[PDB]
């Protein structure tokens, strides 16, 4: 019997990225009731505030990037880059959402939050990530170019985005980009990949 | 036709479901505490996050063991488990009765002890005493959590989860979790046992140690 080895990877990869604003909020709190850091009582209520709206924004963006059904419901390109913005918020790099307001359907909102979150990983030292999205030819065809110092996708996302077992790297980066190659190819789409000199581009397209 | 992430999703919207409770509780709290209208509540506010603080941490670190953990080869001491069960306990009405000696367990095992207790805590819908009882022996590592309470119960999609049947009658977040205690047990060789009684419910499961 094959066991849930990739649910877990996910379940390993999302309790990582919430653990830390998570800790830092009991912490925050710890040097509140210290009284040796009353010193610093308004840092640490920066710190818990901070982590607050971290952990917000990432569970929001996990809801519908990660926790969302294949069931077929619009979702508002407003909303989306509202969740998108959110996870940019905590993160060197700055957002570039080029999407005209419009209604995606789910396989087109999934992918779009996943390939935002993929650009702006490629850049390690800050840089731009570019999102467009543009409904034409019966498709929803997306692009993120991600452009910076040093842009780089790693080689378990590219392992990943081609749906290929993970070999060489962490279980965290490859278990998004599967799961996104996972959710495109079953809607009938695909996935590619444009990697130059400080520029890596995920594009994807799904029908419409 | 190509296969989805449908399982992965369910098992993150369960885990989103969870930690956007307290997570709110957090942002509410600092709301109330900002607020000039509700200064009179700025104790009750403290008191509402470091409470939600607490509960958030201890679903994190039981999640990590419960449902990050790989299935690669590394021993789990019994009474950290404890801590990380007792910790899901700590913010519902029934109790964790924890009553395997202090000892090394195995992936397998650690996992699927961590799964059992909350099935069992969630079996109980107006408390009573989850007793986990667990025993190397015979090759094998043995677990079993007795639930006893008014009106125990196991819900059906937690009982077709355990057999590793599909989603028929029932919500998805208590049946990704019997799914995936499922999956893990038999990908180990094991297997999983349920019993029921009146206001007593029962999940057994062993796997070779
Ligand atoms: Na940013
Ligand atoms: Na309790």
Redesign the interface.
Known sequence: ????????????????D??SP??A??SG?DLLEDPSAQDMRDDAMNL??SS?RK??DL?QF??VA?????SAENFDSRELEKLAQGVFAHVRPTLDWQIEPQAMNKPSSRAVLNIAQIAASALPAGGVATVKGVAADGRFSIIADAKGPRARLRPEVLAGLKGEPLAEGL?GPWVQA??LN??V????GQIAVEIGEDRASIAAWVPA
Do not use: E, K, W
Request: with cysteine.
């Open positions: 019997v094959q066991g849930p080895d990739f649910a877990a990877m996910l379940a390993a990869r999302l309790c990582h919430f653990i998570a800790s909020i009991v709190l818990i505030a607050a952990l917000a569970l996990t809801r990660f926790g969302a059904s294949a279980g599967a799961y996972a959710l190819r079953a809607a009938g």
